[PDB]
Amino acid sequence: ALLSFERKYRVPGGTLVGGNLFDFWVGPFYVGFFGVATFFFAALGIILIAWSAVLQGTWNPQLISVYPPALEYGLGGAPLAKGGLWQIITICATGAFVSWALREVEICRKLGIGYHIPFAFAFAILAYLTLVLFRPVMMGAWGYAFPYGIWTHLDWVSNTGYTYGNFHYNPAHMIAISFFFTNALALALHGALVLSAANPEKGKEMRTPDHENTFFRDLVGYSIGTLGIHRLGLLLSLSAVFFSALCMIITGTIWFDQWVDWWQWWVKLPWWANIPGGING
Amino acid sequence: AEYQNIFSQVQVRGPADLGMTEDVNLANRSGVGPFSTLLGWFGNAQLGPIYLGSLGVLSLFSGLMWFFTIGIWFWYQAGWNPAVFLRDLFFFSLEPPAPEYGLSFAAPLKEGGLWLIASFFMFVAVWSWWGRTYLRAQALGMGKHTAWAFLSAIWLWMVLGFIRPILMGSWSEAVPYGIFSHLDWTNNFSLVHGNLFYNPFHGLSIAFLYGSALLFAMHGATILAVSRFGGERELEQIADRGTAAERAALFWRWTMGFNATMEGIHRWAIWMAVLVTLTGGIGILLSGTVVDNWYVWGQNH
Amino acid sequence: DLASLAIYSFWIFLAGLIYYLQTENMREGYPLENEDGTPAANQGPFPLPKPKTFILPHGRGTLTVPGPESEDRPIALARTAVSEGFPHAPTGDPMKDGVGPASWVARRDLPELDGHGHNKIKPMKAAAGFHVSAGKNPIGLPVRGCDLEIAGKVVDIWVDIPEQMAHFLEVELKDGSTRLLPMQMVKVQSNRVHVNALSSDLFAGIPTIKSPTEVTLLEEDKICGYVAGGLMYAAPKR
Ligand code: BCL
Ligand code: BCL
Ligand code: BCL
Ligand SMILES: CC[C@H]1c2cc3[nH]c4c(c3C)C(=O)[C@H](C(=O)OC)c4c3nc(cc4[nH]c(cc(n2)[C@@H]1C)c(C(C)=O)c4C)[C@@H](C)[C@@H]3CCC(=O)OC/C=C(\C)CCC[C@@H](C)CCC[C@@H](C)CCCC(C)C
Ligand SMILES: CC[C@H]1c2cc3[nH]c4c(c3C)C(=O)[C@H](C(=O)OC)c4c3nc(cc4[nH]c(cc(n2)[C@@H]1C)c(C(C)=O)c4C)[C@@H](C)[C@@H]3CCC(=O)OC/C=C(\C)CCC[C@@H](C)CCC[C@@H](C)CCCC(C)C
Ligand SMILES: COC(C)(C)C/C=C/C(C)=C/C=C/C(C)=C/C=C/C(C)=C\C=C\C=C(C)\C=C\C=C(/C)CC/C=C(\C)CCC=C(C)C
Ligand SMILES: CCCCCCCCCCCC[N+](C)(C)[O-]
Ligand SMILES: CCCCCCCCCCCC[N+](C)(C)[O-]
Ligand SMILES: [Fe+2]
């Protein structure tokens, strides 16, 4: 099936690999070389996971967990049931995410639009590879990565953070959380603005960008503008993930002590380190 | 090579836009503020004008009163020593009344009284500002979406410092006013309730937080991707679908099998964001009042 | 248990909300069609929402969606396979026929009006007080195509008054007439403006506007589509 205005866009071209070989759709889905690659990587990984489910002894979604090689294995390979499948599944996951991005690039080329979406998606992928690849490799072992399990990965988040006390004190974690909070704030506002204009009070006429600018100008003394808010949401989101990746890439590597104590560089500053009074004096 | 539209290549300026009048009392509208060429590379360069009726003045006054109530106490903690003020800036904290005082106001000023005062100013500041988001919308004839979404944020806030402390029977439950302490209160709250990761509402709240970042990244990027077809003019694309809106929808249909409309995407947007603090507020409200330990609660339900 | 009631209830709500959200987003492009233009058999588990009517300002009327869907324009494409799911080949010149990445929608042939009933986009020369405030001014710079040949010169910037944002670069061709070029499809450089999407010989093909001091929604679509379409169809010159 097609959307009423879709056919004029389903033309040949845009593919990065294989010419018109895989240039076709399956229902609403565009295929392409990378659509096939993705399916491959995804099918395998799902299968390899169902297999790990058998070796673990469970078919329950809440229980199936796939752990990386124990620390003792370092960055080498480990037996399938002992961290191998994880290692293989991670390969598939990466292969499927990167393939999904590339498929996107092709969709962009066929549609004549910018590459912003896959570019954005790339940040998520990079966050993922920071947790399962870059940080582990920098730390010396795959055991530092998180396990693939609905609840078991939350365990890893908790233990990993408490390994440094209150993870709240990680300075980069603070910035990251800001962007996430600000992004959610911005999204709530952006959606409410456009909607409050497209859907005015009963019987009235749709408002306009002028009204939108007017509303925020009246409310807080500033309007970023329709091109601006979209530039902002993107910026906030990506910045949020960039700092997430950064807050962890530095943890267990350049800083491995209690994050709270990191803040001592500031308090110990010569010109006030020894002054009495206050909390730290 | 190709331009991305992240920063403007060239800025243009014209007369200060004074905005739509509609049913707004221009007497309360201030004058235009300066123009920021800095802001201009990213978004609109014009600052102001801002509206400030009575409610506005009220809110700004309470707001500052709140902040100053906390700040004076911060100075007092530094012994009025500028050097100590700056170095221990994140360590100062204005704590609530000890449990002993329940929900009374007996507590001494240096022991919860100031907290209650500051909290009072903030209560007025926030609620008055909320009424402000509603009225500014009404004066322009617009929907009340903003005021409704803002209510969801107000909900978490209200629950954290007023509704929960009350049901709990004491102001000691409330959040202290401090950078680091408010973080400590947060960690402690989780430890004390069996770890919020076990709280189904904390988990949903997280899905929406991550969801808001995923969706805004998607949306923002999409609009920028079709800004070459004027996609950023969302209201008119809603009223007369253009090739921008169609390519936007088709990028996602082809990618994930389904898509949005130029108006609908904003409904997805407003809810994704709004549900962060909605589920969150419930999650916290139930903590200590109905569930003491989420791990435990989880074992049974 | 109260918490158990709340979480159970929320999921009920969330499911109904997603339902609602999915239906709201079906106010355009639906019902689904077969490549031949007829209603597809399978429409999915989601029904069409009850119509809603937007009251447009300045007497421009209303917009009711969902509503009868029609391209209201010829689509110069043809099936390349005997079954559904394959690319439809351009029967003529895709750039000129306006299909593929060069597609345009049949939008209203009126201009967009700001909240005050005035034209939202206007050439800068006709916008009182408007002027370049930062960054290199493109006006006067020669316009180079992906084929590295000059195809004209920038004679003005078309501005979005309400947003105070540059939208188009009006470029003058050797024949003396001008064309509009989307700000986002151009690279303003110190000694020129570069256009990757188009080769010199393709600028004349860019659709033209009827009135010199205003462009219409329908005209903007044909201009943006045509230029973007160049990324794929110009290739042989780039
Ligand atoms: C007790 C636990 C510690 C703690 C320990 C940690 C640790 C440890 C970590 C964080 C991380 C984060 N913390 Mg913390 N954190 C704490 C308290 C908090 C609080 C709070 C209110 O208290 C907040 C708001 C945060 C916020 C955050 C975020 C900034 C960040 C997670 C988002 C992210 O990076 O996503 C990045 C996005 C991804 C990783 C997703 C990638 C998506 C992939 C590419 C695609 C998936 C495709 C999929 C499989 C297909 C599915 C099928 C289809 C649906 C059909 N933390 C406490 C103090 N925190 C994380 C971080 O920085 O990570 C980098 C992290 O590792
Ligand atoms: C950077 C953050 C930490 C982390 C910290 C947390 C915390 C803390 C929480 C979660 C929660 C979730 N995490 Mg996690 N999580 C991490 C990395 C991941 C990765 C990955 C490839 O990197 C994935 C796929 C997930 C997936 C999930 C979801 C199961 C769940 C809520 C969805 C959400 O928030 O969506 C945002 C995105 C969307 C709404 C888009 C749709 C995404 C769908 C829902 C994801 C499907 C995942 C699927 C069930 C399992 C794989 C698919 C199969 C292979 C087919 N997490 C890293 C290690 N995660 C929440 C929960 O309830 O956990 C039990 C929660 O509280
Ligand atoms: C060790 C600490 C615990 C923990 C303890 C808590 C607690 C305790 C809470 C959360 C809450 C949240 N947690 Mg947690 N959380 C943990 C780990 C995590 C991780 C992670 C990867 O590990 C993540 C992603 C999260 C994520 C989240 C968010 C989904 C949620 C906050 C929503 C929000 O945006 O509020 C942002 C917004 C507000 C608080 C809105 C109120 C705004 C007010 C109305 C306006 C300000 C007005 C003011 C006067 C203006 C100020 C100045 C002017 C600008 C000048 N947590 C660990 C396990 N978390 C909150 C929640 O709802 O949980 C269910 C919560 O209460
Ligand atoms: C970079 C910033 C933010 C962002 C952006 C973003 N995400 C994106 C995009 C963009 C721009 C897309 O274009 C793409 C998309 O298609 O949107 C729907 C996507 C996407 N983000 C997704 C998820 C996602 N994004 C997240 C976060 C974020 N995405 C950030 C906040 C999160 C979290 C945890 O916060 C999740 C879960 C996917 C829905 C979708 C990409 C779909 C995709 O790659 O499909 C190919 C693969 C499969 C269908 C299956 C792979 C199965 C196995 C091979 C592996 C699984 C093993 C293991 C790694 C998972 C175990 C999970 C456990 C932890 C539970
Ligand atoms: C759905 C939930 C999300 C959300 C939504 C949301 N927030 C909102 C809204 C909405 C829909 C509004 O309409 C409202 C708004 O007006 O936005 C611009 C708001 C808002 N969200 C705010 C904050 C906020 N929202 C947050 C979160 C969230 N908001 C969620 C993610 C957070 C966090 C912790 O994540 C914060 C901190 C406020 C900015 C604003 C409501 C403003 C308000 O209540 O003001 C009352 C009081 C004052 C005037 C405060 C004064 C304090 C001063 C002392 C400051 C500085 C003084 C001094 C510096 C003066 C000198 C200046 C110098 C710098 C030169
Ligand atoms: C140096 O310069 C001078 C001006 C001194 C300025 C210095 C000021 C400084 C440094 C100020 C710093 C302020 C800070 C750090 C504030 C931080 C707040 C934080 C980190 C978190 C806030 C959480 C607060 C919540 C959740 C509050 C909720 C409040 C309510 C729900 C209202 C409660 C109201 C009550 C109890 C009043 C009771 C009264 C009645 C009967 C209605
Ligand atoms: C606009 C709403 C769409 C977002 C749907 C989010 C679904 C993620 C659900 C994951 C969390 C599940 N839970 C209860 C175990 O925490
Ligand atoms: C938990 C959220 C994950 C949802 C996964 C569902 C993805 C939906 C893909 C649906 C599009 C289907 N189709 C073919 C009929 O178009
Ligand atoms: Fe938008």
Side-chain angles (χ1 to χ4, degrees):
Chain A
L2 270 49
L3 286 178
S4 61
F5 55 81
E6 196 181 333
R7 194 188 184 193
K8 62 181 178 293
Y9 301 101
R10 318 246 292 210
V11 300
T15 73
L16 288 164
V17 172
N20 74 157
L21 214 186
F22 304 104
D23 196 12
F24 55 81
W25 289 259
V26 170
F29 303 94
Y30 173 74
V31 176
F33 171 67
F34 295 104
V36 171
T38 296
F39 182 93
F40 164 66
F41 287 122
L44 189 56
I46 292 175
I47 285 167
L48 286 177
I49 286 177
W51 187 22
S52 179
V54 162
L55 299 184
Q56 165 175 41
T58 178
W59 276 133
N60 181 330
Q62 311 279 86
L63 291 181
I64 300 175
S65 189
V66 189
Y67 305 74
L71 292 168
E72 68 172 313
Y73 284 94
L75 289 170
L80 296 190
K82 289 186 169 57
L85 268 25
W86 183 91
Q87 288 180 140
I88 305 307
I89 297 172
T90 300
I91 303 290
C92 291
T94 303
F97 302 156
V98 168
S99 285
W100 189 267
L102 262 9
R103 170 162 174 256
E104 285 201 338
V105 161
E106 283 189 320
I107 291 169
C108 267
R109 304 180 98 225
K110 186 181 295 295
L111 283 173
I113 67 182
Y115 298 122
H116 306 72
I117 298 172
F119 173 86
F121 178 40
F123 280 60
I125 291 184
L126 289 180
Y128 170 71
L129 293 182
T130 288
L131 296 189
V132 302
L133 172 65
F134 312 143
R135 206 179 75 121
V137 169
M138 289 185 68
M139 279 176 77
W142 302 117
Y144 290 125
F146 64 97
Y148 303 147
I150 296 178
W151 298 104
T152 55
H153 84 283
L154 295 221
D155 287 330
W156 175 95
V157 171
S158 199
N159 300 321
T160 299
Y162 281 120
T163 287
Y164 309 88
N166 186 343
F167 213 61
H168 284 165
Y169 284 91
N170 176 341
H173 190 255
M174 284 174 176
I175 295 173
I177 291 178
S178 302
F179 284 118
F180 274 107
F181 283 177
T182 305
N183 184 81
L185 160 45
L187 187 65
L189 290 182
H190 179 62
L193 199 56
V194 182
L195 290 180
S196 63
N199 295 272
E201 307 187 311
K202 196 183 200 177
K204 291 215 171 53
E205 310 174 303
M206 277 173 77
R207 264 44 191 166
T208 69
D210 308 73
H211 289 267
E212 292 177 295
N213 281 327
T214 297
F215 173 74
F216 253 81
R217 229 97 85 155
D218 282 327
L219 184 57
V220 310
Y222 180 72
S223 181
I224 199 169
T226 196
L227 181 67
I229 193 53
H230 292 86
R231 227 125 74 150
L232 186 61
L234 182 59
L235 203 282
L236 295 179
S237 278
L238 264 46
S239 268
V241 168
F242 169 84
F243 276 106
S244 294
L246 185 73
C247 72
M248 298 289 297
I249 193 65
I250 64 179
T251 290
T253 66
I254 85 175
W255 178 276
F256 41 90
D257 295 314
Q258 302 286 291
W259 268 126
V260 61
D261 296 312
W262 172 88
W263 297 82
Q264 289 192 194
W265 74 271
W266 174 268
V267 185
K268 302 300 183 184
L269 256 24
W271 60 83
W272 62 38
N274 299 92
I275 303 180
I279 308 293
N280 313 297
Chain B
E2 258 284 356
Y3 170 56
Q4 283 301 73
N5 216 302
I6 307 307
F7 283 124
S8 297
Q9 280 185 277
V10 58
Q11 303 189 40
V12 300
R13 199 128 91 204
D17 193 308
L18 306 190
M20 305 302 294
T21 303
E22 218 58 63
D23 281 40
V24 174
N25 176 355
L26 295 80
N28 294 316
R29 208 107 109 181
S30 85
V32 203
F35 289 74
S36 179
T37 287
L38 187 73
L39 284 194
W41 293 115
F42 199 63
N44 205 296
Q46 177 187 308
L47 269 58
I50 181 178
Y51 181 111
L52 277 180
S54 302
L55 206 59
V57 165
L58 174 51
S59 191
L60 296 179
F61 178 69
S62 294
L64 293 161
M65 274 318 289
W66 168 65
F67 183 84
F68 289 135
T69 305
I70 299 172
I72 192 185
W73 170 261
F74 270 32
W75 277 104
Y76 169 62
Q77 291 193 75
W80 314 93
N81 192 313
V84 168
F85 184 81
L86 301 180
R87 82 131 193 273
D88 295 359
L89 189 53
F90 296 177
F91 303 78
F92 300 127
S93 172
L94 199 185
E95 310 285 334
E100 336 156 8
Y101 301 107
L103 292 166
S104 82
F105 298 58
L109 286 201
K110 293 178 180 176
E111 307 194 321
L114 270 48
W115 181 88
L116 285 177
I117 289 172
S119 297
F120 177 73
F121 286 137
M122 166 175 245
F123 188 85
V124 174
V126 173
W127 279 110
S128 59
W129 186 276
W130 175 74
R132 181 178 158 72
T133 76
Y134 183 102
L135 298 174
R136 297 303 94 235
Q138 177 176 64
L140 291 174
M142 308 176 81
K144 305 304 162 302
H145 299 67
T146 296
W148 288 143
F150 179 31
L151 196 55
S152 185
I154 291 176
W155 165 241
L156 213 208
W157 168 76
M158 272 292 281
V159 162
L160 288 171
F162 187 81
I163 307 179
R164 182 170 183 288
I166 282 167
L167 298 165
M168 230 48 214
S170 88
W171 298 121
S172 63
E173 284 301 309
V175 186
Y177 294 117
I179 295 310
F180 286 162
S181 59
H182 109 281
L183 294 178
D184 295 325
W185 178 95
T186 306
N187 172 55
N188 165 83
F189 181 108
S190 178
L191 296 169
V192 161
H193 293 85
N195 180 166
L196 288 172
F197 283 152
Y198 290 109
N199 184 327
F201 287 101
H202 181 263
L204 277 166
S205 191
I206 289 181
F208 296 117
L209 182 59
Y210 297 169
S212 284
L214 154 73
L215 190 54
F216 215 157
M218 280 164 69
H219 186 50
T222 294
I223 290 305
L224 296 190
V226 293
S227 67
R228 60 183 63 182
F229 310 106
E232 68 270 45
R233 290 150 57 184
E234 303 190 297
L235 291 178
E236 274 296 295
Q237 284 271 329
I238 287 180
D240 189 21
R241 202 186 65 236
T243 187
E246 302 195 336
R247 306 186 189 219
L250 289 184
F251 168 89
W252 293 102
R253 183 163 200 270
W254 295 357
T255 297
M256 69 186 188
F258 70 118
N259 55 258
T261 57
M262 183 64 77
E263 181 189 9
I265 183 50
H266 298 86
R267 288 189 186 286
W268 276 105
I270 200 180
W271 282 105
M272 178 67 85
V274 147
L275 291 169
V276 171
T277 47
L278 194 63
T279 56
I282 294 172
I284 295 309
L285 181 65
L286 292 163
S287 303
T289 61
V290 170
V291 178
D292 296 313
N293 181 298
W294 290 102
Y295 172 72
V296 171
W297 179 88
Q299 288 302 305
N300 317 193
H301 317 76
Chain C
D1 175 30
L2 210 287
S4 303
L5 175 62
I7 192 62
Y8 170 62
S9 300
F10 182 81
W11 280 107
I12 304 292
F13 169 75
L14 180 66
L17 174 71
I18 283 180
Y19 179 71
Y20 159 73
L21 286 179
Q22 188 45 38
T23 59
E24 279 313 308
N25 282 264
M26 277 168 67
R27 293 177 176 286
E28 295 252 38
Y30 290 77
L32 297 177
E33 307 177 346
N34 301 297
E35 324 191 327
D36 72 359
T38 65
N42 168 52
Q43 292 296 318
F46 298 100
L48 277 182
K50 180 191 69 191
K52 72 183 298 190
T53 298
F54 293 95
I55 302 175
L56 315 195
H58 323 308
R60 292 289 189 69
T62 69
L63 184 253
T64 296
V65 278
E69 289 282 21
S70 140
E71 295 300 274
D72 297 314
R73 50 157 311 198
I75 309 308
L77 288 186
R79 207 134 120 134
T80 56
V82 297
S83 46
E84 297 236 315
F86 292 85
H88 306 270
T91 65
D93 182 321
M95 291 294 258
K96 302 177 183 158
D97 291 315
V99 297
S103 291
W104 52 266
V105 169
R107 310 188 78 203
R108 193 138 28 169
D109 200 3
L110 292 175
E112 203 181 312
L113 274 12
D114 48 47
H116 305 286
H118 297 100
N119 285 4
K120 181 169 181 51
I121 284 71
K122 350 225 305 183
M124 208 178 49
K125 81 218 294 63
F130 278 88
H131 60 286
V132 168
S133 57
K136 168 68 161 181
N137 181 323
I139 300 179
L141 291 181
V143 169
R144 187 179 59 164
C146 72
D147 60 346
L148 304 195
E149 298 300 89
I150 285 179
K153 57 185 159 206
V154 198
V155 298
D156 197 20
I157 292 173
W158 282 55
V159 165
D160 183 315
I161 280 69
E163 297 294 336
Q164 288 202 35
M165 211 71 53
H167 255 282
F168 300 101
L169 287 200
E170 167 156 22
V171 190
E172 196 180 302
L173 310 178
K174 270 42 183 167
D175 72 352
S177 65
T178 65
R179 297 291 183 289
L180 302 190
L181 282 183
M183 259 317 264
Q184 29 275 316
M185 300 300 300
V186 300
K187 182 64 178 62
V188 191
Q189 299 190 280
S190 75
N191 62 328
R192 116 264 282 172
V193 171
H194 196 68
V195 187
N196 267 306
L198 297 178
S199 44
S200 67
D201 75 281
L202 296 183
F203 280 73
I206 302 169
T208 52
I209 58 173
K210 47 184 192 175
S211 181
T213 57
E214 63 165 44
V215 56
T216 76
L217 294 181
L218 177 72
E219 302 183 303
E220 291 187 78
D221 245 45
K222 299 189 184 166
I223 297 180
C224 293
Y226 178 94
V227 181
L231 287 168
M232 176 177 282
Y233 303 129
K237 310 78 168 180
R238 180 170 40 275

